[PDB]
Symmetry: D2
Subunit: 157 residues, 4 copies
């Protein structure tokens, strides 16, 4: 509805962090100092779906070698969600598929979908705290064993 | 502990049934008439495990082209569990892996692990209602999405 | 977004059905003949939430002793979801709480939240297939045991 | 089958720990020094069951104001399971009901089922690492909402 960074954690730029893929990939930061990492709300996502973000107005996006118009939001492992920019919506959809599909940020499949540190460029900040559209899609989900012959059901895509 | 057929559903022999793979595969029957299919207790199995059965004394087993010493028990779709013999423990373990792993009796992978109808042979019955050992093993299990960033965890094998 | 009855299942009126509380309570019907019961889409609802419906324009509602402006949608047990009107939003919220909380349409707590058959009145139909707002709320949810010491977490309200 | 403390964590006595109810309740310790707390294996428990422990030979039990013949094993919050003695099997069953039912060691209901620190008495150690019987029982379990109209089922007691 009105998806943006938690209040105060904007403007932000895409930079690097030793606690996100050992400083090798871009993540949104609200400052240049120790652990000034932008924090993001948890999107309500039901089993059988995914979500990623696409900024409503690209002119308001943070800028590296390009405007960062698409991203995936995921737990950092440090008690809040981080925003991970991607090159485009296709990559964002593929990263969300991996993570909502059961994957981890430390998986090679995830790492290869991040934007590398050498794309930071000028590290320009966003225009304020702009609104992103929550992009939702069905996600193919397998049966999961619970107990005896009880399973939670598959969801086709 | 004392695994055997539900009381009354023994002696049984391995025969065929139009409601189990269209009469093409062996399933334990307690009679030759309409839907006289042996019924079996539900083994208590936690998420992350499987179970199959291996008869304690092979001399007591039902006999087709061989003594039926190993089987997998699974819901029939008709309100009770059926007993599906296999050629050996390896096949039983592979069928249990498939089913407790989320598969279905109508899957080609499952069908290829059943014993074909042409192995019915004399269709000799078991010696009474003999005891089977419950064979338990860990089963590799993937993360399963529940809601938002919540997953039920993987279990290694 | 555009919640309404599945196409063709409108206009509808609130009447009775032998397969919903033995004809004692109102349910939306698209005709007077055998099992002409209106069918409704499944709302996407994540664990930890509920949903009920409130018609956007009351003038378009089906009419009994009052305009039926609020309802809960739930599986009928016959392969589709039925629409169950309530007297007001408070009752609808209480019925959704009961059902998304794990209850059943045959529970006394649910039955007492239905509208009784004697409120059918003229049984006037809706104006076409009008749009309802999907009313969402958090729903207090308890921990649920999965295996060993693993639980899916509580969600506060 | 052969339930006992992890190797090396025996003999043990029932003493106190600042990280278990602020030193107010008994927990098995394998030494008197910093965090020398006995560690215990995870019992395989499926959804819909509980487990607690009853020592096979009481003469081998640790001794306070009484032989500690019954206990519940639960995660400590510090990366291993602790063993919590109870006065008798009834209390152990009630504590296991609470915890496998979704409760926490910090709940007042749990705290009131622990043995108080003033029952430590001589703090005598067990005879080696004795075997406990794993006592299993069904545990009444409620439906749990997963997504949309999907629930994992109740299990009666």
């Amino acid at each position: 509805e009105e998806y943006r960074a938690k209040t105060g954690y904007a403007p932000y730029y895409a930079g690097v962090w030793h606690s996100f893929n050992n400083s090798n990939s871009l993540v949104f930061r609200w400052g240049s100092a120790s652990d000034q990492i932008a924090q993001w709300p948890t999107i309500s996502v039901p089993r059988g779906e995914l979500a990623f973000l696409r900024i409503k107005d690209g002119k308001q996006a943070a800028v590296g070698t390009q405007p960062w118009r698409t991203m995936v939001v995921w737990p950092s492992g440090h008690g809040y969600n981080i925003g991970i920019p991607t090159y485009n919506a296709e990559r964002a959809r593929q990263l969300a598929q991996h993570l909502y599909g059961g994957g981890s940020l430390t998986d090679e499949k995830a790492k290869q979908l991040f934007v590398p540190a050498n794309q930071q460029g000028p590290g320009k900040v966003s225009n304020g705290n702009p609104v992103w559209e929550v992009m939702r899609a069905p996600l193919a989900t397998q049966r999961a064993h619970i107990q005896d012959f009880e399973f939670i059901e598959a969801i086709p895509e």
